[PDB]
């Protein structure tokens, strides 16, 4: 465990590549539903 050695930097915290799309798509549905919630399409419980 010494000769090989290990350490924690900043680029070793490797976020999975697809997070860029999943979070963006999750935001879109939260934007659309919160925009229709002001139109009366859905009620408070459905938004929650």
């Amino acid at each position: 465990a010494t000769a090989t050695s290990i350490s924690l930097g900043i680029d070793d915290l490797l976020t999975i590549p697809s997070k860029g799309w999943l979070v963006q798509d999750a935001e879109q549905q939260s934007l659309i539903l919160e925009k229709h919630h002001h139109y009366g399409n859905v009620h408070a419980v459905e938004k929650l």
Binding site: H36, Y39, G40, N41, V42, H43
Partner: protein, 32 residues
Amino acid sequence: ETEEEARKRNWVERGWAPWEEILSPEADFARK
């Protein structure tokens, strides 16, 4: 009272009136 005089109370006193609502097809589906 029953819904023949209590409904009458809303109209004569509180100005109630069943104005029609123009619901969009997305909002129409929600109510039905």
